Design a protein around this ligand. Structure first.
Ligand code: CL
Ligand code: CL
Ligand code: CL
Lengths: 114, 132
């Protein structure tokens, strides 16, 4: 059973599955799947698992297609890492879930180095 | 007084306060305070001065947390240097302020090139009890 580590940005995270290989760096292309849940009524607000192809991002490069936290938090993950994240509202949906942290679990599927 | 020095990227800067110690190099972790203003009407668009702990960046490594110009212009600054900067749109807000330069003043509060940034106080103590 693992503690959370807190980023400067206010994300709490821990790795539920360590994964293996070289850790993702800023600028890497990363294919991911994830789900996010409310912490007040525990409901799934978003799950990508039903997309054929996993969505891809560039690590550390916010491009408005996912919550801000995800672009940051993939850094340091490896292929098959599963990272559980307690996400503060300013990095998720400050206009839809303004008051509560959201709980995300993110799976890295594939990494293409920059 | 002094002229602006222009970088290749178009940052025009002068040091208002020289600073002390070794110059900042790419990759150094730097705590900075800054404010930026429009030159059309000189209103403040951003100020860090309400943050008791100043934002920190790695010199020369844009991470999208601050305007691009900042990561470049810390290089060669020192602890306590204050640099006044005329910044071109491509390095600031290329959509929001596409048509004017912006005026920034950046102060370097602390440089950590150290990795001497080990743990302190109760954290340090509890860490050591966790080797042994
Ligand atoms: Cl799991
Ligand atoms: Cl929102
Ligand atoms: Cl809420």
């Amino acid at each position: 059973d693992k503690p959370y580590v807190k980023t400067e940005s206010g994300i709490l995270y821990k790795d539920l599955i360590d994964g293996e290989g070289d850790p993702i760096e800023e600028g890497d292309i990363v294919y991911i799947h994830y789900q996010g849940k409310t912490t007040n009524d525990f409901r799934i607000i978003h799950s990508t698992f039903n997309s054929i192809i996993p969505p891809k991002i560039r690590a550390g490069q916010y491009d408005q297609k996912h919550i801000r936290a995800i672009y940051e938090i993939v850094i340091g993950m490896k292929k098959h890492t599963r990272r559980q994240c307690v996400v503060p509202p300013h990095l998720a949906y400050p206009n839809h879930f303004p008051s509560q942290p959201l709980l995300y679990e993110i799976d890295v599927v594939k990494v293409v180095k920059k």
